[PDB]
């Protein structure tokens, strides 16, 4: 998940 650049 990118949702705040975490991009997990
Ligand atoms: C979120 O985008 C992540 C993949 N990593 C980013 C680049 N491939 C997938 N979903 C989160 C992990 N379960």
Same mark, same amino acid.
Request: aromatic content about 16%.
């Given at each position: 998940? +990118?949702?705040?650049? =975490? +991009? =997990?």
């Amino acid at each position: 998940x +990118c949702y705040x650049k =975490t +991009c =997990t």
